[PDB]
Amino acid sequence: EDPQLLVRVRGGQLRGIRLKAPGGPVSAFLGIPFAEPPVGSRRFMPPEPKRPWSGVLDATTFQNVCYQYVDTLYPGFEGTEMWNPNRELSEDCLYLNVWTPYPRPASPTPVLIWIYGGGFYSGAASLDVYDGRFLAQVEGAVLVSMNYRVGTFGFLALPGSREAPGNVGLLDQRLALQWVQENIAAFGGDPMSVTLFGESAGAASVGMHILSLPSRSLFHRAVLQSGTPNGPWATVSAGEARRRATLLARLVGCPNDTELIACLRTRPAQDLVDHEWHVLPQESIFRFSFVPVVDGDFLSDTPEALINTGDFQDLQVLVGVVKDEGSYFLVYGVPGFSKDNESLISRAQFLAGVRIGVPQASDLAAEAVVLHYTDWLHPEDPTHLRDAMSAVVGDHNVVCPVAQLAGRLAAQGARVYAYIFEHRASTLTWPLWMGVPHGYEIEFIFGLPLDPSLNYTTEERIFAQRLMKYWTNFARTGDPNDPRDSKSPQWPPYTTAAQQYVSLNLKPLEVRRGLRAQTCAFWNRFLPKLLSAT
Amino acid sequence: EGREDPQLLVRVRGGQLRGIRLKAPGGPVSAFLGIPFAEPPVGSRRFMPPEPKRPWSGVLDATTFQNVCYQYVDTLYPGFEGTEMWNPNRELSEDCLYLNVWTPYPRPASPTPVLIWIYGGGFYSGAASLDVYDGRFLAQVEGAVLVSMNYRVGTFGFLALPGSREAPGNVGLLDQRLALQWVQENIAAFGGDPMSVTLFGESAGAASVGMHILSLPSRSLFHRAVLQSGTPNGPWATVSAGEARRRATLLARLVGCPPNDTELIACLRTRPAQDLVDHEWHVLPQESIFRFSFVPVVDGDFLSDTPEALINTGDFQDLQVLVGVVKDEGSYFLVYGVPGFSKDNESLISRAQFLAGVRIGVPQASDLAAEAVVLHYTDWLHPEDPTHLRDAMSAVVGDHNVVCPVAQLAGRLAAQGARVYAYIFEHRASTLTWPLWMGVPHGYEIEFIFGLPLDPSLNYTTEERIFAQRLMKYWTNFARTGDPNDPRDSKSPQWPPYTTAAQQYVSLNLKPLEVRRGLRAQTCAFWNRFLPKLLSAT
Ligand SMILES: *[C@@H]1O[C@H](CO[C@@H]2O[C@@H](C)[C@@H](O)[C@@H](O)[C@@H]2O)[C@@H](O)[C@H](O)[C@H]1NC(C)=O
Ligand SMILES: *[C@@H]1O[C@H](CO)[C@@H](O)[C@H](O)[C@H]1NC(C)=O
Ligand SMILES: *[C@@H]1O[C@H](CO)[C@@H](O)[C@H](O)[C@H]1NC(C)=O
Ligand SMILES: C[N+](C)(C)CCO
Ligand SMILES: C[N+](C)(C)CCO
Ligand SMILES: C[N+](C)(C)CCO
Ligand SMILES: C[N+](C)(C)CCO
């Protein structure tokens, strides 16, 4: 028995495991229950706190992955399967993971809490890319990650109902956050210094905690990587949530809210997943059936309204995007696009693609999109058209929503830093045309290139170390710059006047101005004017 | 005769003429100025198609410019050459249908290609007698035969009650056409070749040239065309029959001829010319710039359909066309209507003034269309920078009215069989009196093409002299062959034709030709493809 691996939390005693990081050992406490299993009658319901336990709870292995759809696009392909569940699926999945330095820190240490993405329909804290041992060992950080319910189980909502109120997957995250407040000191973490970070739906989740009052007392700083609470995919109205839940119920043979939800609770988990993609209103990409709902409770208003009127004075935020946000999604439903060729497309394929990539757009709005993104010097060039299609999907869904949030957060008193991540992993298995896709910064921030067995370059390992420092410096201070270090160049705050952000690549930081400023004016200013008028 | 210069006596269909020997820097030229080509369109003839000049007895003196057609005279900037170089330089009269011919001296012995100039001035102003349209340099240096005609402007040339007998519309274009017919019949008398006739014009003159291209009866009267900063398509060069009728009827009311068309037109004919000019600007539907009250009308006769329809469906197989724009097409127009703009300061404007400016500069835009314009031309890194806003306002007016219509025209003509050459003119005259912020404004290429810098008394630089000579060669090579390039020379860089595929045009400045691609390709897609679609849906 190693006393560094024994911790008493409020629920009782835990035993962790000593894991090996390249530079030395870390302590890992994996699969710690933070809620009562949301099973049987508790399906679709808010999470309840985990009842205390007797003896020593074995916290040496990852727990089950929340029940979810498993990708089948490219069977056997690492680029897709690296995001697939790596443990058994179960509705009994409300567990979290803590990595700390070995030995346990002597003084209270800044805490980073990771919230995974996956379109609110997928993901797990147990994926290899979310491995916290490197940040723990190298930067001395306490890293936490939780599982939260996804798909119907996390976000199926009959708004106004007692039994399926919506947003329960977000309440799972919140409960994990409350757990950190109550318990992280036992591991040597500082509950007065908690930084949330997440990517994609995880970043939208971070944003929603920023916009929901009861969450704000549970953290101090936030990082949103390639995702925002505002924008076209991260939320639905109560009406649209009801529509989708009612339709799924119909599809599984479930005929008053209470009756409807009681019958949904009788169905095997896979029966629900079998139909979750049949409820979207359009043929589309970058759209997910069961996501956070504007309920007037967790979200008191739309994210748009809340970011416009919010006060964010005592908040620091780091936000950014990858170089090619849209490319990943094109292979999931835009004809002409494949990982197996260069995906050089015709103009016809581009116009059709725009309707799928911007599915809520009217005919006129779609025409505006096509005319904006066409290079009128090379209107039928397939390379241009392929890269424009990617651009449309990335800008609409990530870059411009990020630019919008960044600007409103800064105008309303927040301290904001922004980045574009432009380094394409040497080990990437997707084709070159996809560039730096959605999600492929994460492995560097977590510091996987520091593991020699994974075959990243020396340059990539130095780069990872740099990024780990920006992120942990941000966690410690609310400022990603290295404070003992002179010689930078310094990463300046993002402001509405100057609009400064930095490139994160193998070269030293370069400061740029305006995140797609002209094109984002189109998405964020013009298209809405077109909508309210048509 | 007996005692005079035998080299200045010429007979035309109407009778005998005596010209004048003029001095150009390199030698003498022959000038025949103020040759009448129509019966004076006065009295009962006001608003009516021109009638050919009846023959005269004896020798008509053709040694001085004749009357300028009755028109509005600019008084925005008294004493200022920038404005006054465009003002009438001879008596204003309705008796104004006279043309001018310059030729080498002695006259050419073999048939020489003819250039015919059509002046601009928004269809409300202009004269062939202005110093910047002086044909002597082209005549002397290039051996050109050059012809220019006065044509009626304003109400006199373009007031229309469409469908009526007495004010059918487009009579100023019919004046131009009568002059073209005159050249066909008579220009061989001066050594000119009626089988080689190139039209050229600027602004409204360029629009006019384009309308001769789109009207079949004109097509037999010329072979090639140059359109400088003007097009028959676009937002200002024509009006519908309905809008023409509305403006004519309002004008009539304003001058005490309240409304049957015969009666209305008969009362208009009793009015003093100056009365008509005094109310001319009161009939425009919006507060605007780059809009003119009385312009060509889509009458279903001269113009069988809209210029837009006609350029989309036309066969332009046997046409060569040279077209282009100056660097700063919009700036000139800003000081005549947009609050905040002036020749006497830097015209740094606020964002409020930009938004107001856009409504005046795109006067037919809905609220949604105008916010589309504002959002496109705003620099979102520097949305309130006065220098950017000033320059963006200029760009809006220039692109809307000239640059994008020219791109549209060049594309349609090229797609439908024409040989097209395109330019951007980027040299600012060292003698320009407009301020620096205005750049290279609308109209300030003309003095180079005509060769005024060859006159040492005009104080242009030596480099400007050489530049002028180049331009004269391009224009006259195009007149001769339908190709501005020199057959003898080579690299000396070549001017490739404009094509829809490659979109090539050249920079005209003091440096050797540089080839560029796409005339404001992205922005003109906004004007030429998106806004119309907005319009159709909205
Ligand atoms: C530039 O000028 C515009 C027009 O006003 C004229 O010039 C100014 C300086 C006055 O002295 C006035 O007498 C003239 O009529 C102004 O509208 C504009 O505000 C001026 N721009 C600036 C920034 O000074
Ligand atoms: C790969 O691209 C080709 C053409 O480049 C396209 O037709 C095809 O659908 C793509 N995917 C397949 C079917 O392998
Ligand atoms: C040109 O230059 C001379 C000598 O400086 C000057 O006196 C004359 O008035 C100028 N003329 C013009 C056309 O500006
Ligand atoms: C098609 N799915 C929605 C299942 C995958 C999203 O990328
Ligand atoms: C958001 N994920 C990283 C889970 C998928 C995109 O690569
Ligand atoms: C059109 N102008 C500006 C030249 C005169 C208006 O009064
Ligand atoms: C258009 N004009 C040339 C006639 C006036 C100055 O631009």
Side-chain angles (χ1 to χ4, degrees), chain A residues 1-483 485-534, chain B residues 1-490 492-537:
Chain A
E1 194 88 39
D2 187 341
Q4 294 287 334
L5 302 175
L6 262 165
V7 184
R8 174 165 260 95
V9 293
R10 286 197 190 174
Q13 287 180 291
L14 308 167
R15 184 160 48 237
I17 185 171
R18 187 168 70 94
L19 296 183
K20 176 58 181 167
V26 299
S27 310
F29 309 85
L30 307 179
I32 303 167
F34 70 88
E36 293 293 278
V39 302
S41 81
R42 301 161 182 159
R43 188 189 270 176
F44 310 127
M45 303 212 71
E48 318 155 270
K50 172 68 181 82
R51 294 174 303 115
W53 57 85
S54 67
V56 186
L57 184 65
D58 167 49
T60 66
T61 65
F62 286 118
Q63 265 283 356
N64 294 327
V65 161
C66 288
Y67 209 98
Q68 64 191 249
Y69 176 77
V70 175
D71 202 271
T72 54
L73 186 65
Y74 295 112
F77 177 62
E78 171 156 297
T80 52
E81 263 151 30
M82 71 174 287
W83 308 110
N84 275 341
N86 63 343
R87 299 293 185 277
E88 291 292 308
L89 294 181
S90 178
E91 286 183 73
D92 175 355
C93 66
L94 293 190
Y95 303 88
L96 60 73
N97 311 298
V98 182
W99 292 263
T100 80
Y102 188 101
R104 182 123 37 99
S107 50
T109 309
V111 178
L112 269 165
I113 306 187
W114 177 252
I115 306 176
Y116 58 76
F120 295 109
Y121 75 86
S122 65
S126 59
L127 302 182
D128 293 344
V129 276
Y130 308 151
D131 187 349
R133 77 221 281 154
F134 311 101
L135 287 159
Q137 202 284 317
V138 182
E139 292 296 337
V142 173
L143 195 134
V144 185
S145 60
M146 83 297 284
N147 280 356
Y148 63 92
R149 283 175 283 170
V150 295
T152 55
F153 312 94
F155 301 95
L156 182 146
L158 290 147
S161 76
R162 204 215 100 208
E163 305 90 350
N167 299 317
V168 306
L170 289 180
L171 290 177
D172 293 342
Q173 299 170 7
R174 180 179 285 167
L175 184 58
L177 268 37
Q178 277 156 356
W179 187 95
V180 168
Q181 289 296 296
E182 295 168 349
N183 295 297
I184 210 62
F187 302 84
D190 192 353
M192 305 200 306
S193 179
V194 170
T195 304
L196 306 186
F197 73 137
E199 185 263 357
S200 203
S205 294
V206 172
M208 278 154 215
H209 295 292
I210 290 166
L211 304 168
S212 194
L213 259 176
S215 286
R216 286 290 286 284
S217 57
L218 308 175
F219 69 100
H220 315 265
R221 278 173 287 286
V223 183
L224 297 78
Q225 302 173 207
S226 304
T228 57
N230 50 299
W233 57 267
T235 65
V236 292
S237 70
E240 177 64 3
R242 180 164 283 280
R243 221 249 324 145
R244 294 175 184 187
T246 305
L247 178 54
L248 182 85
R250 181 179 161 264
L251 292 172
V252 299
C254 279
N256 167 234
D257 284 345
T258 295
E259 273 178 337
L260 180 151
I261 297 159
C263 177
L264 281 174
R265 290 202 304 263
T266 66
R267 295 282 187 269
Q270 192 55 42
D271 290 7
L272 271 30
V273 175
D274 278 347
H275 285 293
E276 83 169 78
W277 298 108
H278 296 162
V279 306
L280 287 167
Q282 260 86 217
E283 181 186 37
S284 59
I285 53 159
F286 220 132
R287 292 294 187 273
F288 318 108
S289 303
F290 298 92
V291 304
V293 57
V294 181
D295 55 350
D297 179 13
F298 194 102
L299 296 179
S300 58
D301 212 331
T302 66
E304 187 181 69
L306 295 182
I307 73 173
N308 287 355
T309 63
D311 187 24
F312 305 111
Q313 299 218 121
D314 296 302
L315 190 67
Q316 309 86 45
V317 182
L318 174 63
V319 297
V321 292
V322 296
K323 196 181 112 275
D324 303 282
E325 291 286 354
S327 65
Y328 195 86
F329 298 89
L330 300 182
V331 304
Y332 280 92
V334 183
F337 289 84
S338 172
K339 81 162 182 71
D340 292 316
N341 52 61
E342 287 172 53
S343 297
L344 297 172
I345 58 155
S346 62
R347 188 155 186 81
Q349 289 178 309
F350 175 64
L351 307 195
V354 164
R355 307 317 305 266
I356 297 162
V358 195
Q360 280 69 71
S362 65
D363 289 5
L364 186 55
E367 283 173 292
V369 172
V370 165
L371 294 181
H372 180 89
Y373 279 89
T374 297
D375 184 322
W376 289 103
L377 274 157
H378 314 101
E380 309 203 68
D381 176 68
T383 306
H384 277 84
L385 293 168
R386 171 250 272 161
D387 295 333
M389 192 61 263
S390 174
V392 163
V393 169
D395 294 346
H396 173 51
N397 289 297
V398 185
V399 184
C400 293
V402 164
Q404 177 142 263
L405 183 65
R408 297 307 301 210
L409 287 178
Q412 278 126 237
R415 173 175 222 56
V416 185
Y417 297 90
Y419 69 84
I420 182 160
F421 185 92
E422 304 189 312
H423 173 70
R424 188 188 146 97
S426 61
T427 58
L428 204 79
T429 62
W430 294 100
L432 293 174
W433 74 261
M434 293 185 66
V436 185
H438 193 69
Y440 291 90
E441 85 281 28
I442 297 166
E443 61 201 74
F444 293 94
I445 302 313
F446 274 86
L448 270 67
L450 280 60
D451 189 347
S453 69
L454 301 182
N455 303 316
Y456 292 89
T457 70
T458 282
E459 305 88 75
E460 282 177 321
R461 191 254 289 147
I462 288 158
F463 178 51
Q465 292 179 296
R466 280 183 51 213
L467 296 174
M468 292 176 83
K469 260 265 180 291
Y470 291 142
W471 262 243
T472 56
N473 278 333
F474 180 75
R476 284 182 273 263
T477 68
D479 180 341
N481 291 282
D482 206 350
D485 191 49
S486 174
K487 191 279 158 299
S488 306
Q490 279 269 307
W491 187 341
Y494 184 91
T495 59
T496 63
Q499 302 175 50
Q500 290 166 297
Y501 63 103
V502 302
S503 51
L504 299 177
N505 53 44
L506 297 189
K507 302 186 280 181
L509 288 183
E510 159 181 314
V511 180
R512 305 179 182 164
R513 289 174 69 170
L515 276 169
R516 296 280 222 285
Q518 288 308 115
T519 283
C520 289
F522 168 76
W523 290 101
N524 299 348
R525 297 170 192 269
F526 179 65
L527 282 187
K529 277 173 206 255
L530 179 51
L531 183 65
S532 53
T534 304
Chain B
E1 70 185 73
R3 259 60 204 64
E4 306 145 308
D5 191 345
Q7 305 193 304
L8 292 173
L9 309 171
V10 170
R11 172 173 290 274
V12 296
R13 174 71 248 251
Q16 272 182 312
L17 306 165
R18 183 177 41 250
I20 186 167
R21 184 183 132 144
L22 295 178
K23 305 166 167 188
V29 300
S30 321
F32 301 89
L33 309 171
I35 305 162
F37 66 90
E39 290 298 311
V42 303
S44 55
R45 303 221 228 279
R46 183 193 279 176
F47 312 125
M48 307 209 72
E51 303 176 272
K53 178 64 183 186
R54 280 139 35 187
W56 56 86
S57 65
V59 183
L60 179 145
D61 187 271
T63 66
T64 69
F65 292 113
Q66 266 278 3
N67 299 330
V68 170
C69 293
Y70 215 100
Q71 68 189 249
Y72 176 87
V73 169
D74 198 283
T75 39
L76 181 63
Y77 295 121
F80 180 52
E81 168 132 33
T83 51
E84 280 176 15
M85 66 177 281
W86 309 112
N87 281 337
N89 63 339
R90 292 285 177 281
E91 182 178 337
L92 300 178
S93 175
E94 289 185 79
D95 175 8
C96 70
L97 293 188
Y98 299 93
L99 58 78
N100 307 302
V101 179
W102 287 264
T103 77
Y105 182 103
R107 295 197 300 281
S110 69
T112 305
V114 179
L115 274 163
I116 303 179
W117 179 247
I118 311 188
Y119 59 79
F123 293 111
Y124 75 86
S125 60
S129 60
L130 301 186
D131 286 347
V132 282
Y133 311 145
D134 184 351
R136 77 180 69 198
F137 310 101
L138 285 157
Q140 204 285 321
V141 175
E142 288 299 335
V145 172
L146 196 140
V147 182
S148 55
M149 87 293 277
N150 282 356
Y151 62 91
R152 288 174 280 173
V153 294
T155 57
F156 310 95
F158 296 100
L159 183 142
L161 288 164
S164 71
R165 205 217 75 199
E166 306 93 345
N170 297 326
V171 306
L173 290 170
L174 287 178
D175 299 341
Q176 293 173 19
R177 179 186 282 165
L178 192 54
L180 304 198
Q181 290 168 341
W182 186 99
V183 168
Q184 286 298 301
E185 173 145 30
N186 299 291
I187 208 69
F190 299 84
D193 185 357
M195 293 184 160
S196 178
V197 179
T198 302
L199 310 182
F200 73 130
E202 184 267 352
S203 197
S208 299
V209 164
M211 284 169 207
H212 293 297
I213 296 179
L214 301 171
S215 193
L216 271 150
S218 290
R219 286 296 290 281
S220 59
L221 307 166
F222 70 102
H223 313 269
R224 281 171 289 283
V226 182
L227 290 78
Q228 307 174 209
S229 308
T231 59
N233 54 299
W236 56 267
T238 64
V239 288
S240 65
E243 178 64 4
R245 176 164 290 278
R246 190 193 67 76
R247 292 181 189 183
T249 299
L250 183 53
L251 184 104
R253 285 194 178 284
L254 290 175
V255 299
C257 295
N260 162 247
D261 284 346
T262 296
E263 286 193 2
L264 186 153
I265 300 160
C267 183
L268 284 175
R269 287 194 307 259
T270 70
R271 293 301 177 251
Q274 191 64 50
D275 279 1
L276 301 185
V277 173
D278 292 353
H279 295 96
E280 180 169 23
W281 297 99
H282 299 319
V283 304
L284 286 169
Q286 301 93 192
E287 185 182 5
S288 51
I289 57 169
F290 221 135
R291 297 287 187 279
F292 317 110
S293 292
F294 296 97
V295 297
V297 56
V298 182
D299 56 351
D301 184 19
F302 196 106
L303 292 179
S304 66
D305 207 332
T306 68
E308 183 193 353
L310 297 179
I311 72 182
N312 295 351
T313 66
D315 198 20
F316 305 112
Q317 235 180 206
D318 270 62
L319 195 65
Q320 307 98 49
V321 185
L322 171 62
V323 305
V325 305
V326 295
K327 192 181 113 271
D328 302 86
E329 290 285 358
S331 57
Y332 188 92
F333 297 89
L334 299 184
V335 300
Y336 284 93
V338 184
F341 290 83
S342 181
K343 80 165 190 77
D344 298 318
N345 64 43
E346 292 299 286
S347 296
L348 300 168
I349 56 156
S350 63
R351 182 153 190 89
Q353 289 174 318
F354 178 65
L355 304 193
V358 168
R359 300 325 292 268
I360 300 158
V362 195
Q364 275 77 71
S366 63
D367 293 348
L368 187 54
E371 259 313 309
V373 167
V374 165
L375 297 176
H376 182 82
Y377 280 90
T378 292
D379 179 328
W380 294 99
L381 276 177
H382 304 108
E384 292 198 293
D385 184 83
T387 301
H388 171 80
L389 290 174
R390 170 252 268 158
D391 293 338
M393 191 62 250
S394 178
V396 165
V397 172
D399 294 344
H400 176 46
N401 291 297
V402 184
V403 180
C404 295
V406 166
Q408 183 95 292
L409 183 63
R412 296 311 298 208
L413 295 184
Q416 280 141 226
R419 190 141 86 256
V420 185
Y421 296 90
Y423 68 83
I424 184 169
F425 185 93
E426 305 188 309
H427 175 70
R428 184 188 159 90
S430 69
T431 63
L432 205 72
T433 58
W434 294 103
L436 284 167
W437 71 259
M438 298 200 184
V440 185
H442 193 67
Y444 289 87
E445 87 282 27
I446 303 172
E447 62 200 76
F448 293 89
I449 292 147
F450 275 85
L452 274 67
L454 305 227
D455 186 351
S457 72
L458 290 187
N459 295 341
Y460 292 89
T461 66
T462 285
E463 306 92 71
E464 283 175 321
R465 208 225 335 120
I466 287 155
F467 179 50
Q469 293 178 291
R470 275 176 60 216
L471 295 180
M472 293 168 79
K473 284 252 163 46
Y474 291 138
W475 258 240
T476 54
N477 286 334
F478 179 78
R480 288 179 276 252
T481 69
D483 184 346
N485 295 289
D486 199 295
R488 307 161 188 197
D489 202 339
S490 204
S492 214
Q494 300 300 287
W495 187 337
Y498 183 85
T499 55
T500 66
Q503 301 180 66
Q504 294 173 296
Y505 64 106
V506 297
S507 51
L508 298 180
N509 55 41
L510 302 178
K511 302 184 279 173
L513 286 191
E514 151 182 310
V515 179
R516 291 175 200 175
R517 279 149 203 82
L519 258 163
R520 305 273 245 271
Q522 281 317 106
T523 290
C524 289
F526 165 80
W527 290 105
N528 294 342
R529 303 170 185 269
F530 174 70
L531 282 186
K533 280 179 169 183
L534 186 49
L535 191 60
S536 305

